[PDB]
Amino acid sequence: SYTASRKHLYVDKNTKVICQGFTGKQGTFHSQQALEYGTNLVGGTTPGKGGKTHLGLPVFNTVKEAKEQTGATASVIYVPPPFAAAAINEAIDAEVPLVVCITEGIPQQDMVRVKHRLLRQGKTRLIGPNCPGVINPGECKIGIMPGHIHKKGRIGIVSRSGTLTYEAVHQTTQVGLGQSLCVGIGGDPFNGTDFTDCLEIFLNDPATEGIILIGEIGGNAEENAAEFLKQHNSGPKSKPVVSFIAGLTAPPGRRMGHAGAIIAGGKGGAKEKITALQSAGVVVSMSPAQLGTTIYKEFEKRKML
């Protein structure tokens, strides 16, 4: 099942990464940054040059190759829009455990064709597309997120946006809380991993004591989240969940940046999202400026500090 690959989301110091789209002006910059941070970046694909060395590191013509050859367990893609989905499928083929598609702009039709497949195999798990990635602070970083702002700790973070997440992470560390695992699932309407996918992981993580969920207008992923928490997070040992949803001031009918950030046909507004999560026990910060202070207080009430 696809459900059964959720576990691959928890990357760590043991995980070895290959970057599909290695010599590209993008896979370049992030690989130097991934190695610096301290990530197990073994190499990278890039058809044509498939045999050379880039950045004091091996290069292959394909994904299937570089897998075996380097043993590797995670693939991150920086391949431009028109091909990016091909790359996802080239990764699901060679049965890679974790695939992280950073690329923005992939046709929505492409992604529905991708999820057609992706929801059949269970060896692969995809985060993305149009997402900053995943980070297990101190252990492993796969994506375009500034690492130095993370502090290993107790809060599991899941967000549909990039920099807004950075706000949260900064705000948590500044109150000294830290993070266990952060997953940016992306701003697109059809993607490989949703909120509930991540919440299962956080709810069963002993390292995770609290959760921050960042959302926005568009789609129903937030409402499914609220449903899932009602069902699996009530009762004597529930973890506190703090959340912020963007787009309260968004006008309808417009694409607020992210392809999936649009209130359409009367569906996708923030107000209903906020009301649902509240109904599931989720304390929703009104200001996006208060996610650190808000979850801080939650820990303090339950005396978890």
């Binding site: 039709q109 702002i149 807004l164 701003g187 129903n220 912020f244 006008p251 607020m256």
Partner: protein, 393 residues
């Protein structure tokens, strides 16, 4: 993106979907000579603007209504005069509405039966979906509310393709009796393929129906195209006028910037969409009225901070500015510098409030406060918002 009705019928026509015969007009005379040239019982004259609402909308020529039926080629002309050149406002456009440069003079048609049929990718289904009610004519969102049981759906398999039985199953639920049925269904099949062929996020037909003469016709239809598929739909996007797009919005796109206006006096500009939405929100939470939403992406670059400010310069409704930039990938003093370079260099005269965050934030703030400019450094997003707001009371 959205095309004009005459462009999307064209398109539907060339992909085998049956629509009304029609003519497009740039003048009130071509329109009038078009109603004569059609030659039919009745005529529908419809102004062309992308905003829905035309029916009950109002022109600035005084004329009420963007849609009109008349059997006399003359009424067309007199009505045209009042459309070309003027602006049409609808329950869906800016208060002074969109300007109109063409009208469509099509042959009305007797609508025997009116149904609702639409195709999109569903956000909970993954994969195409047919949504149709035998109760067409009205705004779907209302049927859905008053009579949820008149709304049928048929999930389709993106790899497989639409199945003959599904089209029949739908045609059936839609109200088509015996003969008509196999013709309804084939139109459905033709739409679904049109839909996948063009990278539409949605193909909506309302009303989808039958004439007394025995034909299955899409008398009306809205089509939304996936902006990401443009690189593989150059023909279709070639038709996108951009005439209707808001000005600042247009400019902003030239520089990969993404702008959207609101009705306030406190502009802002952020890097990342999520955070740009949150920025508009915090301002309002604190009593402000965000002027716009601007997303620079993750592409900070001295060039853009400049175009970004340049743009804000336009909207003379703006009384202040809040810059929320979360650095991460770069030194915050370089950003502060480019902010100020761009600022004097753009001879600004509106209170600026900047909140930079990332690397080397202290010196970066020094530059902003030690610039001579009417700038103000902010501690955090809440401090930023509170100020901007104070800054204009």
């Amino acid at each position: 993106m959205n095309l004009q009705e005459y462009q999307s019928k064209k398109l539907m026509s060339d992909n085998g979907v049956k629509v009304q015969r029609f003519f497009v007009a740039d003048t009130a005379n071509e329109a009038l000579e078009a109603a004569k040239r059609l030659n039919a019982k009745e005529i529908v004259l419809k102004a062309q603007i992308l905003a829905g609402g035309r029916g009950k909308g109002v022109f600035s020529s005084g004329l009420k209504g963007g849609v009109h039926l008349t059997k006399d080629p003359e009424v067309v002309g007199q009505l045209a005069k009042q459309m070309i050149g003027y602006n049409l406002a609808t329950k869906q456009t800016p208060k002074e509405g969109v300007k109109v440069n063409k009208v469509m003079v099509a042959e009305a048609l007797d609508i025997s039966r009116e149904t609702y049929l639409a195709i999109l990718m569903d956000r909970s289904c993954n994969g195409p979906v047919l949504v149709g009610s035998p109760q067409g004519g009205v705004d779907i969102e209302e049927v859905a509310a008053s009579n949820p049981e008149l709304i049928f759906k048929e999930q389709i398999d993106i790899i497989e393709g639409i199945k003959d039985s599904q089209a029949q199953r739908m045609a059936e639920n839609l109200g088509f009796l015996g003969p008509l049925q196999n013709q309804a269904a084939d139109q459905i099949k033709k739409l679904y393929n049109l839909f996948l062929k063009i990278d539409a996020t949605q193909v909506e037909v309302n009303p989808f129906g039958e004439t007394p003469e025995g034909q299955v016709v899409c008398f009306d239809a809205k089509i939304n195209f996936d902006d990401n598929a443009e690189f593989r739909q150059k023909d279709i996007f070639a038709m996108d006028d951009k005439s209707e797009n808001e000005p600042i919005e247009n400019e902003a796109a030239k520089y990969d910037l993404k702008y959207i206006g609101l009705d306030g006096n406190i502009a802002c500009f952020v890097n990342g969409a999520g955070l740009a939405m949150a920025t508009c929100d915090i301002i309002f939470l604190n009593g402000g009225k965000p002027a716009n939403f601007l997303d620079l992406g993750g592409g900070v670059k001295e060039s853009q901070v400049y175009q970004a400010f340049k743009l804000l310069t336009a909207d003379p409704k703006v009384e202040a500015i809040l810059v929320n930039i979360f650095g991460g990938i770069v030194n915050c003093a370089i950003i502060a510098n480019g902010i100020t370079k761009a600022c004097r260099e753009l001879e600004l005269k509106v209170p600026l409030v900047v909140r930079l965050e990332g690397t080397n934030v202290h010196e970066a703030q020094n530059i902003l406060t030690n610039s001579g400019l009417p700038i103000t450094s902010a501690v955090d997003l809440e401090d930023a918002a509170k100020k901007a707001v104070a800054s204009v009371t």
